[PDB]
From a paper:
Finally, we would like to remind that apoferritin, with its high stability, rigidity, and symmetry, can easily be resolved at atomic resolution by either cryo-EM or X-ray crystallography. Our results demonstrate that an atomic resolution structure can be obtained on a 300 kV Titan Krios G3i microscope using the K3 or Falcon 4 detectors with or without an energy filter, which thus gives users having this kind of instrumentation the possibility of performing single-particle cryo-EM analysis at the atomic resolution level.
In addition, we also collected a second dataset using a Falcon 4 detector in the electron counting mode (MRC format, not EER format) with a throughput of ~500 movie stacks per hour, resulting in ~7700 movie stacks from a 15 h data collection.
Author numbering:
A (entry chain D), B (entry chain F), C (entry chain T), D (entry chain E), E (entry chain A), F (entry chain S): 5 to 176
Write the structure that this text describes.
């Protein structure tokens, strides 16, 4: 037992390790998306920048979870970071839709984590999740939904002009 | 075939994808090391900072390789990032020794990549490797060797005082 | 023999004179393109600016090659600069495609020059080419490929609106 | 017919295309002279700088003529830029004498152009020539004549000391 | 074996030790030249300054080679620094000619070193030489050739006025 | 005889040439020591910096002696700079002890030089030595003695921790 451990359940520790892996996976997915939009036959630089920023933010989230694990006296156990489900993301709209789905999956995992923390009477972990993750997820999901709405209304993905102008005026 | 591709061999493209995976793996190893030194029962904050900086640098190297792949008209294919070989790195000296071994492995891969680029008459790729990777690897290996030498001479890992003072005076 | 000449093969000297002519020719092609887009019945000012900048850059490349020739003790022999293959470049997309083809031709000449320098064991010339020309060519080719991709996706050349908006938002 | 064309004779358009070629040729001659003085066995850096500046100025004159052609609704037709009559310019004094002869030839062409514009009742073209070319030519010819006079009086080309000191004190 | 040594051939290590000695020797030669021009019966202060600067630059080159030797895990073995071949350098022109010969000898040694590094498949050493030594040697040789040309054309060494004015206007 | 020579004995001139060689030799010894401490298996960066600074100071002393030789109308005659007696200096303490011995040898040579100048009634040379060398030697010897004392009291060379902490706190 760690000398700092107090009111930290082994189930919570395991769930935090799983969340660390999920955040690293999301970072990897966003990295793949960014460099898809960096291809010469796609060439949407602001889509690339947007998804690279998301990748770095997901890495920061994972590192905050590892810091939490150490603060509470749990032990970090890392697992393989699985490759993203796609090599080719097919369009700005498709990438935004996949990102929306990914963020909702991460949010579901965070909500299950909060439910576990509540069931284990761990208010510090509950507040950690609330303060650093839940509203960030809600804001990200709302922004991605807005982006999907606008791309669809402008006529993406069929309209390369739509994706070009969205890249310039919303993401630039 | 990509409209930008010129004098870029499929073997070189494959080798670059392998190097991308290796750099991401090295980033993951350094991340694990950093948060090992963040544990309450290790508590060497400057070891943690040193290895976190290395992790971020390895990520930047991987992203530079992906950018190169797109610049030359190759296609990025990502693979799983395997978990590090250790969860517990046992000491500052042991972590520095493992980092030295890892950097020499990465350097060997880069040298094989340069040999392939030379054999394929790809001077742009040769110079890319020389400019951005080879001397960085040599400098990193020399620095890690210096750190290992100093820790051993001060009496690590048996001397917790040795690791404490090295953390303060060399890494701080 | 020049008092400064050392390890400089006559074949390399001839190849450098040929490269000087090729760079001057590329400068002339870009000049023609720029002032095509300055016509009242074309009127794409940022296409004109882009190609004029390319023309001046090609002139600078030619002058750097002449400076190299003198540094190594070779002798500059200038030839006629042939007129560009077109007087009318037909569209922004067509001009970008022709520029991509031209840059790939120049890159091929530079790669043959590097192969000659390698065969003659002239590492100074090899590094001169690597440092000042090869990555510039790769970057130019990637940028032109990106431009061609975006123009095609926006609907050029049939879409005068596509070329207008590309002129404003990418080249402006 | 161009929508902007007004009071612009086809003879004037042809003469302007010829002048564009002549200015580009003069630029090329000055480029050759500059890098002759950059040779290790000539080594007069301020002669080299002087003639390189002249080369760039001639390019600017050519581009101003192309801009004029488009402003008036004429169409630019480029021709080969012939190589300079010399590879070796033999001395600072000889190069200055050749430059004087070249500038007087360009001035003669400009005066014939002005006579044509007057005969065609094209006051805009007349004033364009007067404003941007005629006094520039007179000033250049006077300066080159001054340089030739001083070099001859100092004892060039027989006096390498004369050319050295002129390079330092007049052109530096 | 050094813990940092990787892909570093014993032949390359020996060649680097020889190059260190050669650079120190060149530094000594330039020191001798500088203080020859500091003599009361020579009294060319800017020749003295020029050669002293060259001496210090050669020392810096030697120290960079020693740093490289340690970076790669080789071991420095110093040898005697032989005295320069002359005590009296006879004139500014003669000293410049001897310096040109010395720089071409150093360049030949560096080119042989690069050939050895290429034969041993040591791209880090190849790029080290290319980046830090080859173009510096080419530039130094071109500058010395220019100086020799100008001194000869001004009438050195017979013209003490020639050497005086060169000292003032080129080296001052 | 030099036109500036006055009250300058040939014995003094010879002794000054010998002192020039001795100072250059001391510079070389300190250079060797510095790069010994730059080795990956020694890795004491502030020892390396200290001895490199000493090497540069010894070079400056040698150049001041050559300047003196020319000021007095003597003639500089350079000799080989012998290699240092050691390639491996074994420890910070051993290097400091060798440096102390070297500085006392140089001081003895300077004192013999002053005795010669006194015997030859050369007060300018006497004061030159007093002003620029004697107290510098005394200060250097006292500082090296202090360093040796502290290293011995801290437990060097057996205590790698002693040398590490001395490197950090006294030489850093
Ligand atoms: Na767990
Ligand atoms: Na689990
Ligand atoms: Na915490
Ligand atoms: Na591949
Ligand atoms: Na592979
Ligand atoms: Na690239
Ligand atoms: Na030739
Ligand atoms: Na040819
Ligand atoms: Na050069
Ligand atoms: Na015409
Ligand atoms: Na005509
Ligand atoms: Na106009
Ligand atoms: Na050796
Ligand atoms: Na040897
Ligand atoms: Na190195
Ligand atoms: Na003597
Ligand atoms: Na003697
Ligand atoms: Na004096
Ligand atoms: Zn514990
Ligand atoms: Zn659980
Ligand atoms: Zn691409
Ligand atoms: Zn792109
Ligand atoms: Zn964009
Ligand atoms: Zn997240
Ligand atoms: Zn998988
Ligand atoms: Zn696709
Ligand atoms: Zn709350
Ligand atoms: Zn493609
Ligand atoms: Zn391969
Ligand atoms: Zn902990
Ligand atoms: Zn801690
Ligand atoms: Zn700390
Ligand atoms: Zn790396
Ligand atoms: Zn695994
Ligand atoms: Zn442990
Ligand atoms: Zn010549
Ligand atoms: Zn050839
Ligand atoms: Zn027009
Ligand atoms: Zn227009
Ligand atoms: Zn515009
Ligand atoms: Zn070019
Ligand atoms: Zn033609
Ligand atoms: Zn048209
Ligand atoms: Zn718009
Ligand atoms: Zn028209
Ligand atoms: Zn006409
Ligand atoms: Zn030359
Ligand atoms: Zn020159
Ligand atoms: Zn000059
Ligand atoms: Zn003109
Ligand atoms: Zn011709
Ligand atoms: Zn000539
Ligand atoms: Zn060793
Ligand atoms: Zn060898
Ligand atoms: Zn004197
Ligand atoms: Zn003097
Ligand atoms: Zn002077
Ligand atoms: Zn050198
Ligand atoms: Zn000797
Ligand atoms: Zn003499
Ligand atoms: Zn290179
Ligand atoms: Zn004068
Ligand atoms: Zn004398
Ligand atoms: Zn004596
Ligand atoms: Zn070493
Ligand atoms: Zn070291
Ligand atoms: Zn240190
Ligand atoms: Zn001294
Ligand atoms: Zn010896
Ligand atoms: Zn040792
Ligand atoms: Zn006194």
């Amino acid at each position: 037992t760690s000398q700092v451990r107090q009111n930290y359940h082994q189930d919570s520790e395991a769930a935090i390790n799983r969340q660390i892996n999920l955040e690293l996976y999301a970072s990897y997915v966003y990295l793949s998306m960014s460099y898809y939009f960096d291809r010469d036959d796609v060439a949407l630089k602001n889509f690339a920048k947007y998804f690279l920023h998301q990748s770095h933010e997901e890495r920061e989230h994972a590192e905050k979870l590892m810091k939490l694990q150490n603060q509470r006296g749990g032990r970090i156990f890392l697992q393989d970071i699985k490759k993203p489900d796609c090599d080719d993301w097919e369009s700005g709209l498709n990438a935004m839709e996949c990102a929306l789905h990914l963020e909702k999956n991460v949010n579901q995992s965070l909500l299950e984590l909060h439910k576990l923390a509540t069931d284990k009477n761990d208010p510090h972990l509950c507040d950690f999740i609330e303060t650093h993750y839940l509203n960030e997820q809600v804001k990200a999901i709302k922004e991605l939904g807005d982006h999907v709405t606008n791309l669809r209304k402008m006529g993406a993905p069929e309209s390369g002009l739509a994706e070009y102008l969205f890249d310039k005026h919303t993401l630039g």
